[PDB]
Every structure is written in structure tokens, then in C-alpha cells.
Amino acid sequence: ENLLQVYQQARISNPDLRKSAADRDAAFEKINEARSPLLPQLGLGADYTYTSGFRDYKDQNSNVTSGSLQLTQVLFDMSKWRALTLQEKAAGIQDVTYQTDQQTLILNTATAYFKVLAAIDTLSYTEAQKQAIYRQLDQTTQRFNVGLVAITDVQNARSQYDAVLANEVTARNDLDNAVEELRQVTGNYYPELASLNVDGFKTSKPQAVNALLKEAENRNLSLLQARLNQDLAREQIRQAQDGHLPTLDLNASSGVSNNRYSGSKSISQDADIGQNKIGLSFSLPLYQGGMVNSQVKQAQYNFVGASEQLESAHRSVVQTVRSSFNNVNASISSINAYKQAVVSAQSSLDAMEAGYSVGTRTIVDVLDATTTLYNAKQQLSNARYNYLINELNIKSALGTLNEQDLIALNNTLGKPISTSA
Amino acid sequence: ENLLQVYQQARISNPDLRKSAADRDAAFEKINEARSPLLPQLGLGADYTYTSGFRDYKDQNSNVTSGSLQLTQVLFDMSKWRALTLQEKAAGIQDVTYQTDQQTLILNTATAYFKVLAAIDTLSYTEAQKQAIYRQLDQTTQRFNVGLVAITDVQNARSQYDAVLANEVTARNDLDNAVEELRQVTGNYYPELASLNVDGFKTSKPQAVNALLKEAENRNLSLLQARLNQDLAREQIRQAQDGHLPTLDLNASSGVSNNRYSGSKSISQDADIGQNKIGLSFSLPLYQGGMVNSQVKQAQYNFVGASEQLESAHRSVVQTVRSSFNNVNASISSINAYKQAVVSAQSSLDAMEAGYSVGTRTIVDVLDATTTLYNAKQQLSNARYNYLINELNIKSALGTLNEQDLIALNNTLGKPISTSA
Amino acid sequence: ENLLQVYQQARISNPDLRKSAADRDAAFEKINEARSPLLPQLGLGADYTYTSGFRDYKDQNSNVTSGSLQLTQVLFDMSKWRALTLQEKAAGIQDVTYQTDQQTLILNTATAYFKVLAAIDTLSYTEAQKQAIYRQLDQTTQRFNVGLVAITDVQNARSQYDAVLANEVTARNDLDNAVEELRQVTGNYYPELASLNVDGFKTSKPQAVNALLKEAENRNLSLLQARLNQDLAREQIRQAQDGHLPTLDLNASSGVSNNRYSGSKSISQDADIGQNKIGLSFSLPLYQGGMVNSQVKQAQYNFVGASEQLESAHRSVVQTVRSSFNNVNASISSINAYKQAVVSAQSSLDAMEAGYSVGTRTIVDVLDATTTLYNAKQQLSNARYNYLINELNIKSALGTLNEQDLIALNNTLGKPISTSA
Fold first, then answer.
1. Which of B223, B244, B326 to mutate to test the interface with A (most CBs of A within 10 A)?
2. Beta-bridge partners for C193
3. Contacts of residue A71 in chain C, CB cutoff 8 Å?
4. Which of A1, A253, A278, A311 could pair with A5 as two cysteines, CB 3.0-4.6 Å apart?
5. Phi first, then psi: what are they for A418, rounded to 5°?
6. Residue B269: how many other CB atoms lie within 10 Å
7. CB contact (8 A) between residue A301 and residue C163
8. From C353, which residue of chain B is nearest by alpha-carbon distance?
9. Is C134 exposed, middle or buried (0-12, 13-18, 19+ CB in 10 A)?
């Protein structure tokens, strides 16, 4: 149909993106799950015991029926506060991952679309190669039936034709499997896609690499995730440090009991009482053997690990940006080179035909020139499509990949073409 | 030896499969580990305190020697029941993974076997190519020593011979490394394997793709694992919902104590008592700040995630099945094409020899035709072996991969051949 | 600059290695975190309640102000001891992983260095190929302007020149991206590297494969990690078995309270008391429903799993060693073969030039011979560099990879060469 519509259908019906969204929302709710303990923790309890006497208390039994409405509340517990902040930061991380999955979806959809298109172009060029080989083979066959050309040329052409047939089979299989991958990405089978407009296709030199690097270190996603994890490790250090601190707990209750002491020797008086109390509960772990002073060092070493992960991510980002810039410029230069190559190879094929007419060159040279020509055409098409893919990879490293780049692309796509075979 | 015996030795002595089996059994025992808490939790305790008086209780000491035979039991705790069911479902999942590992073992063993065989065939064809090149080179050398052919042809043939030597070295290394991988899979080194019977080799068109897809969505393993995980997520939702519910606990004891109050101001009476009691313990978390109402939403979002994983698995399965069907048909068509190509290339080589005898064609064309012929033979052999591998991949996507398919294959294998070099 | 200096800069400024070191130290501190509980666990508590009377205790209130200096200590708890030993073993495992990361760093640095060098050599040979093609094209152009050669040869040469231009573009891009990867590894951009000294380059047959296998099974790192995990599983079995055992706990306190009973019906006497006690606390889980007898079976099955992982690691090690030995010998044989091929191809190119002068051979054959010659040169260079890489892979499987092997290598490197283009 088109690239934009394909991305729409994907975004609407892609499961990996939906799973990342689910995880994001699950984290944003784990936030409340962690806020819970800082809120009142009202409860309720009961009991019914039957005490007896095994020795020295013989015949002194009892029948209790107790209830309780225990309530709890936390006035100072920094560990829970830090866990809450940690969960907020993890939610931010999962949001970043959702963004990354959006970008990955756009990129994979475009990659599959252009793989399908390159497969179509390759199949068409291979079929054209086969047709040209068959034309030459038929010419030689007729000129042999009359008595001009020898069986040698016929057999050479037959061999080349068979090889081309095998290559065509391979190309058809590749095209079908590419359509299947496109389906796996989007969900539907596309019998007609939007082709490329080479009559107006043009390449634009990318922007300065230093500006790309600034925009990347500012807006990239893996780097952002790394620095978020660094902040998370800092907060973990603080969480561990908070182990040295006290923990208040405003308790409360509405206790009630119904004692019914029984037995012969039972002397105590049956009492049905109710006890309501409200009090605090301090705590201060003076010493624990080194749990806190060890968790702190662990958290500091994990913070070091996160800092090093951040540096590694910066290096990977620089590599990605530089490689994408370089291979974009390379795709441009190769487009130009393969254009010149196609022109020169068509000229050389005409010259080889002239020579075969004369007698200098041989049909094998003609067929090799034809193969070279059509291989050059294939390489040119693949270079165009790789240029597009590499532009997208650039815009991905920058984290500025969105439907707008896909619109800029779709502006390029022109007439439709079938995925048949 | 043969493919069936190789698979037997593997299944008997493959460590990855054994590890998956170990994990399966570990889960089936974690079942009982989780059933435990629902069973009585009898225990035993003791104590020996020496109380004193810091202020207002001075000279009022004590010496207690207490014992206890605490017993516990759970009459209503849905969280534990749901954990038990969860562990049962995880055991089912691990069983599915064990099945998947069985299939993967069969497939990897066959892949390695056929890689070794293709390496042997490639090495043999390369050696034959070298021998033909040397025959032509010796013919030219003699015809030059007599004074017919020029040094030019000798040097061309020498160059081609050297290139073939290098390719032969590469092929020998590949064969040896393939034998080593086969060993890594099975455990033993195989100096004689069972070759292919091309004199009776034939290709059977696979069954309809729609029937394949039905059988796959019914019997595939990744899809089954995905739906099992979906059910697991449902049970997790119920487990979380169960947080709103009460929790009974039938307590019990046989308490005994021996108080020996000491001190000058000690007025209480020394008592050696025994207290046996049996009672219940209700519980009802009216409010907790949102822990349950948050765990529930988390579980619902994880259920959504599992549903999306299931859809992704369905898509991947469709892709796998369609790709396997397509590349099977492609292997058939390529077998036929490369057969025709080998025939035509042998004919063209004979024609080039005739031409070199005449004077039209040149020795370079002869050697290029020979190289084409033997490359075509290599491609044909590799196409056969890939057809077999792709049949196996089909039967894997369907989840119907077992020793029976390997027997159907081994029926194909014929005379033995050595892995030497 | 050089290989040794590059490895120095890497080791000093590589983030992955630093992260592995951080994890190692974090484990060696988790050791103390786990030793903690076996040490005194002094604490401190307080309380302030206001009891009332709901029914039958009306007007019998209270105002307590309690304190406590609870102390704890563990005299027999085998679970904690086994956890301590487990953490020690995990620290050993992480140390092994740090060693593995050191080796991986050395190997990746060398791989990137030699990839860059091979890219430089390939680019230079491609530029030389282009220059030779242009020389032949200019000769033909002049001989056509005078009236000797036909437009046919001119066009053939033009086509070949264009193809070479495209290949040169690809090579330049590959070189730049390789330099970028080298940067990602080390941290700095290297405009001048140390080239290879082919004038004294030589290959040494590796040592016997059986000795390699002994040294590997003795000093390899994955195998060592596997057996360490096996021992860890044994200790886990013992940890689970320890669930049957008792658990003493030397309690202690310095309790103090200030009761201020209030109310009209309040008859009890206000008391400000202090209670200091010190006692033990036994424990003996006679029955638990099968938790211990199930954890034990789980640990035994996990021990089986670790044993199978160990066997798999042994097999993978054997495969790695045998493959490295084989492909080293293959690199040697291919070096020799490609040397002979380069010599013979240069001779054949001279012969083709002579023939074109005569009239037998054609310019297409000349250019094909030139392409073959320079492809052979590329293959020779790549074979040298792969021989070096495979020597390093050998020394890696043996676990004997260190700065000394890099020094042995750097001894090979000679004059410098630029990474420009």
C-alpha cells in the first residue's frame, strides 16, 4: 500500500510494542504498590483459645474469645521513601525503553519494506537477464540451424541460461520470505507495495558529524537509560545509608476479650474486658555486624558499574553515529559509481555484440558482459535502498526517529508494484 | 556410522537435554516444596532466662526453663493454594521446554551430520577440479615441450591450479571443523559416516500450507508455552485478588515452664507449670494503602503482556512455516535447475575442449568452464542437503519432530564414506 | 601507535572490564554482608502507650513509657554459615569472570587492530588495481586515437575501471568504520598504526593438540567456572540439608518501663521498674510438610544440571581448541598457496600482456588476470592476519592469554602506516 499506512497498521497491531507498554504501566502502578506501606495499614484479628493444665495447673482451664482492630502507621522510615523514589526512577527507565521500542518498530518496518522492494527489483533484473540470455541463445540456435554458428556457442549459452534459472529460483524464494517477514512485522499480507521513484530520486549530504554527536549525546535513548541507571544507583546508595536510621511506627488497637476461666481449681474471675490503646514504637539498630557498612560499599561499586556502563554507551553511540555517517556517504559514492558502471557496461555489451558480429569477441564474453551489466544494476538498486536504511539508522542513533522521517521517505515512494512472482 | 545411531548416542550423552530434564524434575519437586505450608508445621522451642532488677525490682530475680511444642495448620489461605497451582503450571512449562530441547537436539544433530557430508562432497569435488586442471596443465606442458602450445597457456593453467589448491585447503579445514562440531554434539569422533544415495534420491512435495498452519497452531511448542504463560498470568491475577481474603491458622501447643524465682525481696512463689492450649487465629486486612488493588492491576498488565507474547509467537510460527515451505519448494526447483546446469556445463566443457583443439576457444575458457561445472556440482549437493534440513525444519515448526522423521531420513542414507582428508 | 600501547590504553580506559571489577568487589563485600548475622545484632527499642477501657475496664487507663536495649547472638545456625560459604564461592566465580573479561579485552583489541590493518592493506591493493586498470585503459585510448585498438577494448576497460571504483569506495568505508570500532574499544582515534613486517614474517607450527587439551582442561576459564558452579551446587545441597537442624539464639536485654496507671477505678500501683534478662532460644522444626526433603531434591537436581553444564563446557572447549589448531594449520597452508598463486598470477598477467601484443589473448583476459592477481594478494594478507588472530584464539582457549602474547606479537609489527584515505 505505502510505507506510512504500513507503519500505522504496525503501531496499531504490533505485539512487542504493546508488551513494552504493558511493562511501563505495570511499573507506574508498582509505584503505588510501593507507596502503600507509608499509608495506614489497618487490619483485624481474632482468637479462640482453650488453655488447660498439664502439671501444677491441673483443672485450671480457660476459654478465651479475643478480637482486635490493630492499626499501624509510619512516621519516619526512609527505606520505604527511597524504595518509592527507586520505583519512580525505574518507571522512567521503562518509559525510555518504550520509546526505544517505538523507534525499533519504525526501523524494522522500514527495513522489511525496503528488503521486499529490493527483492522485487532483484527478481525483475534476474528475469531480464534470463530473457536477454535466451534471446542470444535463440539467435545462436537459428544461426546454427542455418549453418553459421557452431554448437559450441549454443552450449555455452545453454549453460549460462541454466545458471540464471537457478539464480532466479533463489530470488523468488527470497522475495516470498521477505513478504512473510513483512507480514510478521505488520500483520497483513501486502500484494501491492509502493515502489521507488528513481526518476526523481536524489541523495542529500547529511549534516555535520559533530552536530550529530551533540544531538545524540543529548537525545539518544541508550545513553539516557544509562544515566538514569546511574541516578538509580545513587538513590540505592542513599537507600542503603538509610539503614543506620531509626524507624517510628504509630501503633493502635481496639482490643477486646472474653475470658471464661473454667475448671474445678479455677479460682480466677471470669472477665469480659475491652482494651483500647495507642502508642509508638521506636527502633535504632546500633550495630548489626556490618550489614549497612557493606550494603553501602556494594551500592558504591554498583554505581561505579553504572558509570562505566554509561561510558560504554557513549562509546557505542559514537561508533554508531560515525559508522552511519560514513556508510551514508559511501552509499552516495557507490550510487554514483554504479551508475557510471551500468552505463559503461551497457556500452561494453553493445561493443561485444559488434565484435561477435565481426569475429574478434566471443559469445562467452557477450554473456559475461550481460551478467556484469545486470549485477551492476542489482548493486545500484541495493545501494539506493541501503542509503535509505542508513539515513534511518542515523535518525535512530539521534533518537529523532518518528513518523515525520517516514513521511519524508514516503514522499520518495511513487508508483505501486506487485509482490507476485 | 549412521544418523539413527548418532541420534541415539546424542540423546544418551547430550548435556543440554540432561540439564533441561534436571530443571523439569526440580520444578516437579518445587511443587511439593510449595504444598508444604498447607500441611502441619509442627515445631519445638525452649528457653532459659535469668531476669534481674535494675531499679524498683532490685533483688527480684528469676530463673526460667521453658519448653514448647508449637504446632500450626492452615485451614483457609488462598495465596498458598494459588502458589501451588502456579508451580504446577510452571512445571508444565518446563516440560514443554524439555520437549523443545529434544526437538532442538534432533535438529542440531541432523544439521551437523549433513554439514559434515556436504563438506566431504565439496572437498571431493574440489579435488576432482584440481585433478582436471592438472591434467590440462600437463597436456599443455607436454605440447609446449614439443613446440605446439605457448608458455601463456601453461602460466594460465598454473594460476588456476594454485587457486584451486587454496580452495582445497579451505575445504579440508572446513571438513575437519565440521567433524569437531559433530563430536561436540554427540561425544565421539566418527571416521566413517553414512553417505547419500543419489541414485534413488527423490523429493516429495510437502503438504498444503494451510494444513501445516493448523497442525502448527495446534501442536507447536513456542505457541503452547505462550498460552501456558497466559494461563499462568491469569492464575497470578487470582493470586493477587486473594490478598483481600482472610487467613485462618489453627494454632496449638504443649507449653511447659519451670519458674525458680530467686532473690531476697523475691516474694512470688516458685512454680513448675504446664500449659496446653489449642486455638485459632483469624485475620482480615481491611486496608493496606493499595497493595492488593495495585498488584491486581500489575497482574492484569502482565496478562496483557503474555497475550501479546502469544500473538507474537503465532506470527513467528506462521513466518517459520511459510518460510520453510517456500524454501523447500525452492530447494526442489534448484535441484532440478542445477541438474540441468551440470549437464549443460559438461557439454560446454567438451565443446570448449573441441574448440581449443580447433583454435577458436582458449584454455582460459576451458578452465572457466571446468570451474563452473564443479561449482554447479557443489551447489547441487548443497541443495540436496539443504532440502533435507528444510524438511526437518518444517517438521520442527509443526512440533512433530521425533525419531520417526530421522528413520525416514536414514532410509535415504546409503553407502558409507570416510571423514578423512 | 603500536599494539602494546593500544592494549595499555584499553586496560586503563575500558568500561566493561571496570564493570566486571566492580561486580567482583561487590561480591567480596557481600561476603561481609552475609557474615553480619553471625555477629551480635544489638538494637534499641522504645514505646509509649495509653491504654484505656472499652467495657468492664472503664476508668482503668495507663500511660507506659518503655525502653529496651535488646541484644542478639547466634551460637548455632548452619544456614547462615553455608550462605557465607556460598558467597565466598560466588566471589571466586566473579573473579574467574573478571579474568575472562581481561582475556576477552585483549582478544577484541587485537582483533580490531588487525581488522584495521587488513582494511588498510585491502584499500591499498584496490587502489593499485585501479591504477593498473587505468594504465591499461590509457594505453588502449592512445592506441585507439592513433588507430590501432578499437573502441571495444576502451569500453571494456572503462567498465572494469568503474567496478573497481565502486569496490574502492566500499573498502574506504570499511576502513573508516574499522577505525571507529578500534576507537570504541580503546577510546582514542589512531591516525598512525604499526604495520606488519612481511619481510620477516614467519609461521610457527603450534604445539601438539593433546598437550593443548591438557593445558586447557587444566587452565581454561569457562571450564573452571563450571566446576566452581558444581561445588556451589554441592554447598547448596548442604545448605538445604541444614534445614533439619536446630537454631540457638543467645538473647539479652536491659528492659525498663515507667507505668503510670491512671483513672478513677484505677487500683493498681504506679511502678517505675527495670528488668534485665539474658537467655537462650532453642528451635527444632520436627516437621514442615516436606520443605527440607524437597529443597534437598531440588538442590540435587541442580547439582546434576551443573555437572551437565560442566560436561558441555568441556565439549565446547575441545571444539574450540581443535578448531583453532586446525584453522591455524589451514592459515599456514593457505599463506603458502596464495604466495604461489600471486607468483603464478603475476606471471600469467605478463603472459597475457605479451599475448595482447601478439593478438591471441584479449584485453578482457588481461584485466581478469589483473583482478585475480590483486584478489590473491588481498587473500594472502587476510590469511596472515587471520593466522595471527587464530594464534590468539588458541592462547585464549588455553586461558594463557596475557600481555606476553601481545609482546610476542608486537615484536612482529614493524614500520608505521596511516589510517587515512
1. B326
2. C417
3. none
4. A1
5. -90, 150
6. 7
7. no
8. B152
9. middle
Which three-class secondary structure string do you get for B300-357?
HHHHHHHHHHHHHHHHHHHHHHHHHHHHHHHHHHHHHHHHHHHHHHHHHHHHHHHHHH
CB contact under 8 A, B312 and A16: yes
Resolution (A): 3.3
Question: Which one of B298, B339, B362, B372 would you mutate to disrupt binding with A, by most A Cβ within 10 Å of its Cβ?
Answer: B298
* Strand stretches in A3-149, DSSP E: 45-49, 66-68
Cβ burial, residue C361 (10 Å; 0-12/13-18/19+): buried
C-beta separation of A12 from A72 below 8 A: no
The method recorded for this entry reads: cryo-EM
C positions 186-205 inside 8 Å of A (CB): 187
**Cα C156 vs. chain centroid, distance in angstroms?**
50
In three-state secondary structure terms, C267 is coil
Chain A residues in contact with B295 by the CB 8 A cut-off are 33
Across the interface, do B279 and A57 touch by the CB < 8 Å criterion?
Answer: no
Which residues lie closer than 8 Å to B248 by C-beta, 6 or more apart?
B74, B75, B76, B77, B280, B281, B282, B283
The number of distinct structural domains making up chain B is 1
Largest CA distance in chain B: 136
How far is B105 from B12, CA to CA, in rounded Å? 11
Do the chains contact at C169 and A334, CB–CB below 8 Å? yes
Please give the DSSP secondary-structure letter assigned to residue C55: B
- Tell me whether residues B51 and C338 touch, CB distance under 8 A: no
User: Is residue C26 within 8 angstroms of chain A, CB to CB?
Assistant: yes
Residue C184 and residue A316 in contact, taking contact as beta carbons nearer than 8 Å? yes
Measured CA to CA in angstroms, residue A332 lies from A327, A328, A374, B392 at distances of 9, 6, 20, 43
Q: Name the percent of chain A in helix, strand, coil, to the closest 5.
A: 70, 10, 25
**Cβ atoms C118, C384 nearer than 8 A:** no
In 3D space, the residue among A254, A273, A266 whose CA is nearest the CA of residue A50 turns out to be A266
Angstrom distance (rounded) from CA C395 to CA C208: 13
Question: What's chain C's Rg over C-alpha atoms?
Answer: 38
Nearest residue of B to residue A158, measured between CA atoms:
B344
CB-CB contact of C80 with C73 (8 Å): no
Q: How far apart are CA C158 and CA C130, in angstroms?
A: 11
* Residue matched to cell numbers 505450608: B37
Alpha-carbon gap, residue B419 to B193, rounded angstroms = 7
Structural domain harbouring C275 = 1-421
* Chain A stretch 129-188, residues whose beta carbon is closer than 8 A to a beta carbon of chain B: 150-152, 155-156, 158-159, 161-163, 165-166, 169-170, 172-173, 176-177, 180-181, 183-184, 187
Residues A392, A394: Cα–Cα separation, whole Å = 5
Radius of gyration for the alpha carbons in chain A, expressed in angstroms and rounded = 38
Q: Which residues of A touch B245 (CB under 8 A)?
A: none
- Note whether A352 contacts C152, CB cutoff 8 Å: yes
CA C365 – CA C154 distance, rounded (Å): 14
**Can you tell me the distance from the alpha carbon of A105 to that of C64, in angstroms, rounded to the nearest whole number?**
65
Residue in the block written with cell 525490682: B57
Residue A159 DSSP SS3: helix
Instruction: Give contacts of C 320-379 with A, CB under 8 A.
Output: 362, 364
Select from C130, C152, C164, C188 the residue whose CB has the most chain A CBs within 10 Å, as the one to mutate to test that interface: C152
Give me the helices (H) in A288-362, please.
Answer: 291-358
**A231 burial type by CB count under 10 A (0-12 exposed, 13-18 middle, 19+ buried):** middle
Q: Report the distance separating Cα A384 and Cα C274, nearest Å.
A: 89
